[PDB]
Curated annotation (Swiss-Prot), chain C:
The modification Phosphoserine is found at S13. This is ATP-citrate synthase. Disulfide bonds: none annotated. The chain holds residues 827 to 918 of 1101 of the full protein. Phosphorylated by PKA and GSK3 in a sequential manner; phosphorylation results in activation of its activity. It comes from Homo sapiens. Catalyzes the cleavage of citrate into oxaloacetate and acetyl-CoA, the latter serving as common substrate in multiple biochemical reactions in protein, carbohydrate and lipid metabolism. Homotetramer. In the N-terminal section; belongs to the succinate/malate CoA ligase beta subunit family. In the C-terminal section; belongs to the succinate/malate CoA ligase alpha subunit family. It comes from the Eukaryota. It is found in: Cytoplasm, Cytosol.
């Protein structure tokens, strides 16, 4: 989308990236004055303001400031300071827009005559670029197309200064003729290198010292940043000069920024009655057009869209902002909310309606307090259940809600709302039943949609011969041919696909914008491909004009650049046109009709399929050409392609505002070329260049024998009239409705709409990852971090699913700090060191150390808890317990050490014992274990209570003595192994430390020498 | 048991699951010390056909974001002095979400670039230590030790629900054997 | 029931071109288990069937068995056998 850039950034890009030998002047001499700017930093940063003469002018995309008189001319620093006092912060009025003034640009004032100022303007058209030059520039030129010398430089070609002198500088002065060619050639090279669209240097002043550029205007193709962000830098695209944005409008702008959908809102009238929250691109302009054409020009409140399947939270925010904007004012005649839309492609209608009715139930009180009337029209998949949900909320709340579906005309909903009616060479046969395509890329949804269409249209051969993807190797994707399961080969390079499949002639380009150009330029040199459909979006206008040029050379037709494709019922379907097989079977697009149509946007193609289906005998071949600026094939090429086919009997065309193409339709039908009955309507009149607008195209086509309705309410009526005339004349013979083959639907779609009931394994009462917030045990992650529970708190949530108290969470952190590394001598740390010295990696080193924590290493954390808790719940005195574990063998687990005995404590069992005796309420099992250790220290002094026994008995005591465990979960976790989990999660820090440390000392492979082995092999087995 | 169940879960933390923690630090710090713009780093990374590690997620998007990325960002803005690599990574993230909404800067990329910031912009690591601890693999250990709590929680939960042996039904398989070998 | 009467649809992951366990015989790569035992191929033959999905010739099968015989134990000094001894001595 080519959009405008400021004069400051235009002069900045010009002065920085121009490549000329001519004397450029005033390079990087401009100052930006805001309402918020100071003057000391301005004088320190730009000293020439205190040395030269100044010209100050507002740069807010103001066109023709000389004809308005907002330019400060030839002033000092105090001159511009005294002149900018009624200019900074005052709502100026430019054209038909009164808006704030908040931006000014200061240039060094130059001396110039009337015969020094010229006019240079390079603007891009479809064939190439127009370099327009005039030897008499300025503001009072007037006729911008009736005097100046133009020069069309072709695409992928350069402009030579000898050509500039031959065609462009015939009437230039002779003392400017040598430097002007160099400046114009450098300006064209900079234009072509920075991907501009329209660069207008007026008025240019070439004098004896050099070249001055007084005023500048520039539009740059904003989607060329992936090729020129290093040259642009931080481009600040300015909004057009108008009123400041409402905070709700800026809120929906922020939603569109941080969303993945398109969420547009613009409040034309914050007091009026007609609010329109309509999903779709062309749906919003069609609904606003039939609001304007039914007397609702002045009282139309807002216009905008929520297109491209927004999330439930995002559509709730958008509908909440609309229902809050229609609430603050009161209208006693009545407010009308048109929640419109066309037929959706793949979105479940009930989910978007769930978001909107959440926003409606949040505003039911004000919505009944302000006398609203809600009119809903929607189509697509599961629109029956969606409109039934909306009717349920209209019954339960009490507000008037009127739900209409595919059976209704698209904008008769606003007819029955305002009180107007009661409420109830290139080839021709591109696609054939032997046409096999080549998809480019992983787009398995679109390929399965195409294969479902090829099954249901009674076609015996799949229309995907092979897919092509170079980022993975050759393999065979699994796809569904009806009930059957087939393998479709995805090839790495296109050479293998065009070798093994020489029957293909169409490549569907599902590459992204960073590979679509290279992919279709690789494609276009293959001889069998005779048409190319590029479904991507974001491709720049320069690259798509090079695509148009090489398509016209190689003779392929292109239906690429921003489209959904186009469906020929019975033969072929390009990706996701039509939608699901529900839409294909409801709009009867499985058998060939007799009508062809052309559209520009892909959002109104579904409404065209619906209208021609409900009012005719079908669609023969329909094509949407794309939502780009220079489409790969315009309307006239497809109308000429329809003319040579023996199957078409009438042609519908849906045009739009901008671009002179319906005039080519007029000239083609008038010059004896078109015979079959053309019906057309140019959408988006809504004007509340004036020679190419929609009312101009309507008044031009209405007289020229083209059937043109008055509004969009009557398009199906006109098409039905033309069809019943054509069946009265006996040319159209409608065939019999043969029943199609049937496909099974989908497990995902059937569970989404809810009629399958499959039993689900993996019960998992922990960590609900889905939804919008990562929910732990029952508590969200934001509450986990807000309530300041540490990793002991999340251990209590993940493992035990309880909110543990703050002493117990800190105790679990204490246990995971003492059961960290305990030296590399031990078995698990030794295994981790051997795997790290064999150079393995972190997860195999830590993992092959962790497969020793069984019974003899790391088993005293759990054995000394099961022992001390079995022999405490059986009611045994500590002396009887010590003697009972004496007569049965069975050394007491968790009691013993090698050095630290008594009057020489363990000094990490003391920290845990201090914490437990200070913080734990009612700890009986630690006191029992301390009685046992006091009995058994009399035998040997080094029979102190081990840390592996103290963590066991303190953990069992914590579980069965703190809150929220009863006593039967409090030893279920002991039986399951929460203590083994505590030791393994603690010692994982030590094992990862040993891996990193043996990786950091750069140790080699270990061999364990034969001096420490002593083989004891048998004699001869 | 605990060590075999947790361990057979930990032997999947590779490159596609959870081992992007180190590659989303090596890549983002190899394209910051050879300083390019994000809009050319993405172009180079697509041109080479390799995945920008720590920028993609299967189930989360910009219309369905994961909140754990936001909890770390609101900590590393405040208590972290001078973290430029995170700003670089957020730039690359929004460059890629302008094209596809699926590709969202993971926690496995945010922890990688925030750990490179915490190593090279806090004290005690000069420049050879703070790059040795990226080359050795001290950032995968953060994910493995963090996810051990989740895997032990899943072992304890499936042990407490008393669930049976898993069998994975044949309607989810589609055997694609040769003809007669 | 909705897939037994054949109406729903399901995309199935896990493509596995080896060892169809269903049916009345445990089929390997393409060869049933009775053909595996009647053709007198050793464990090298089923290594060729499961790993490579080709019925390898009978000299390559004996070579695969010869490789699995020489790449058996090579003393417990080496690091993998040493880790196995440490985990067995921890009694796992
Ligand atoms: C005989 C001698 C060697 C025994 O010394 P010792 O320290 O008792 O060594 P032991 O292994 O027998 O001690 C183990 C005791 O602790 C107990 N014990 C050991 N580990 C235990 C554990 N985890 N849990 C509970 N109890 C444990 C044992 O059950 C045993 O207690 P018991 O008597 O009730 O059975 C010692 O007395 C000695 O040195 N005699 C020589 C002195 C002499 O005459 N010198 C010559 C003169 S110059
Ligand atoms: C984890 C991962 C498999 C999820 O991605 P995904 O949702 O499955 O996306 P898909 O692989 O299905 O789709 C592939 C398309 O998206 C692109 N893409 C997907 N992930 C990408 C990534 N991290 N970086 C760059 N491109 C990516 C592919 O290049 C391809 O482009 P195309 O449209 O031109 O064909 C992938 O993003 C990845 O490997 N990321 C790095 C590892 C990681 O960070 N894991 C943490 C999250 S699990």
């Amino acid at each position: 989308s080519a959009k405008a850039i400021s004069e400051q950034t235009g002069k900045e890009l010009l002065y920085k990236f121009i490549c000329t030998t001519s004397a450029i002047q005033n390079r990087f001499k401009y100052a930006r004055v805001t309402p918020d700017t100071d003057w000391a930093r301005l004088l320190q940063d730009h000293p020439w303001l205190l040395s030269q003469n100044l010209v100050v002018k507002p740069d807010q995309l103001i066109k023709r400031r000389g004809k308005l008189g907002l330019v400060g001319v030839n002033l000092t620093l105090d001159g511009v300071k005294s002149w900018l006092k009624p200019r900074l912060g005052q709502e100026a009025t430019v054209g038909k827009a009164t808006g704030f003034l908040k931006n000014f640009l200061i240039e060094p004032f130059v001396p110039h005559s009337q015969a020094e100022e010229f006019y240079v303007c390079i603007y891009a058209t479809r064939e190439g670029d127009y370099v327009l030059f005039h030897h008499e520039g300025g503001v009072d030129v007037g006729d911008v197309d009736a005097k100046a010398q133009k020069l069309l430089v072709g695409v992928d070609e350069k402009l030579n200064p000898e050509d500039i002198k031959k065609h462009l500088l015939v009437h230039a002065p002779e003392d400017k003729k040598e430097i002007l060619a160099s400046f114009i050639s450098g300006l064209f090279n900079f234009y072509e290198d920075l991907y501009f669209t329209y660069l207008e240097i007026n008025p240019l002043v070439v004098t004896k010292d050099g070249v001055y550029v007084l005023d500048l205007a520039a539009k740059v193709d904003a989607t060329a940043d992936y090729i020129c962000k290093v040259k642009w830098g931080d481009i600040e695209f300015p909004p057009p000069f108008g009123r400041e944005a409402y905070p709700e409008e800026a809120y929906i702008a922020d939603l569109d920024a941080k969303s993945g959908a398109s969420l547009k809102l613009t409040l034309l009238n914050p007091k009026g009655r007609i609010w329109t929250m309509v999903a779709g691109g062309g749906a919003s302009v069609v609904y606003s057009d039939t609001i304007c054409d039914l007397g609702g020009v002045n009282e139309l409140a807002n216009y905008g869209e929520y297109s491209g399947a927004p999330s439930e939270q995002q559509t709730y925010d958008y509908a909440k902002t609309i229902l809050s904007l229609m609430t603050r004012e009161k209208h006693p005649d009545g407010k009308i909310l048109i929640i419109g839309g066309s037929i959706a492609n793949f979105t479940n209608v009930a989910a978007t309606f769930k978001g909107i009715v959440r926003a409606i139930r949040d505003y039911q009180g004000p919505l009944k307090e302000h006398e609203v009337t809600i009119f809903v029209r929607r189509g697509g998949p599961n629109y029956q259940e969606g409109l039934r949900v909306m009717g349920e909320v209209g019954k339960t709340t009490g507000i008037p809600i009127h739900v209409f579906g595919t059976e209704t005309h698209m904008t008769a909903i606003v007819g029955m709302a305002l009180g107007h009616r009661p409420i109830p060479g290139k080839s021709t046969t591109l696609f054939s039943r032997h046409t096999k395509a080549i998809v480019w890329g992983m787009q398995t949804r679109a390929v399965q949609g195409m294969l479902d269409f090829d099954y249901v249209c009674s076609r015996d051969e799949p229309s995907v011969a092979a897919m092509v993807y170079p980022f993975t190797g050759d393999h065979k994707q699994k796809f569904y041919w009806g009930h059957k399961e087939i393998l479709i080969p995805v090839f790495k390079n296109m050479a293998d696909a065009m070798r093994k499949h020489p029957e293909v002639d169409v490549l569907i380009n599902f590459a992204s914008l960073r590979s679509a150009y290279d992919s279709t330029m690789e494609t276009m040199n293959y001889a069998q491909i005779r048409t190319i459909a590029i479904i991507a979006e974001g491709i720049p206008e320069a690259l798509t004009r090079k695509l148009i040029k090489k398509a016209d050379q190689k003779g392929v037709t292109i239906i690429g650049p921003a489209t959904v494709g186009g469906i020929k019922p019975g033969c072929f379907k390009i990706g996701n046109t039509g939608g699901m097989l529900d839409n294909i079977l409801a709009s009867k697009l499985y058998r060939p009709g007799s009508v062809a149509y052309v559209s520009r946007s892909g959002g109104m193609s579904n409404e065209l399929n619906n209208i021609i289906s409900r009012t005719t005998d079908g669609v023969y071949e329909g094509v949407a050409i794309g939502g780009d600026r220079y489409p790969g094939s315009t309307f006239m090429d497809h109308v000429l392609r329809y003319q040579d086919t023996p199957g078409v009997k009438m042609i519908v065309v849906l045009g739009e505002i901008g671009g002179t193409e319906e005039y080519k339709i007029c000239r083609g039908i008038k010059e004896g070329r078109l015979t079959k009955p053309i019906v057309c309507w140019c959408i988006g009149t809504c004007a509340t260049q004036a020679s190419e607008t929609a009312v101009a195209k309507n008044q031009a086509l209405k007289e020229a024998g083209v059937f043109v309705p008055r509004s969009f309410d009557e398009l199906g009526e006109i098409i039905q009239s033309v069809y019943e005339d054509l069946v009265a004349n006996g040319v159209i013979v409608p065939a019999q409705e043969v029943p199609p083959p049937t496909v099974p639907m989908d497990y995902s779609w059937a569970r989404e709409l809810g009629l399958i009931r499959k039993p689900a394994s993996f019960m998992t009462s922990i960590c609900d990852e889905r939804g919008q917030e990562l929910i732990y045990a029952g508590m969200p992650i934001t509450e986990v971090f807000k309530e300041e529970m540490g990793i002991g708190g999340v251990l209590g949530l993940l493992w035990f699913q309880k909110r543990l108290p703050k002493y117990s969470c800190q105790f679990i952190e204490m246990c995971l700090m003492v059961t960290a590394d305990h030296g590399p001598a031990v078995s698990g740390a030794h295994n981790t060191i051997i795997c790290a010295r064999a150079g393995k990696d972190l997860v195999s080193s830590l993992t092959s150390g962790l497969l020793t924590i069984g019974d003899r290493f790391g088993g005293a954390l759990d054995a000394a808890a099961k022992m001390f808790s079995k022999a405490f719940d059986s009611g045994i005195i500590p002396m009887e317990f010590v003697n009972k574990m004496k007569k049965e063998g069975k050394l007491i687990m968790g009691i013993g050490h090698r050095v630290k005995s008594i009057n020489n404590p363990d000094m990490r069992v003391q920290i845990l014992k201090d914490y437990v005796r200070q913080h734990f309420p009612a700890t009986p099992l630690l006191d029992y274990a301390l009685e046992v250790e006091k009995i058994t220290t009399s035998k040997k002094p080094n029979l102190i209570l081990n840390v592996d026994g103290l963590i066991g008995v303190a953990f069992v005591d914590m579980l069965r003595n703190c809150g929220s465990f009863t006593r039967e979960e409090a030893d279920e976790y002991i039986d399951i192994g929460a203590l083994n989990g505590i030791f393994v999660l603690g010692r994982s820090m030590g094992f990862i430390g040993h891996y990193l440390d043996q990786k950091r000392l750069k140790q080699g492979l270990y061999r364990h020498p034969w001096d420490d082995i002593s083989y004891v092999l048998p004699e001869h087995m």
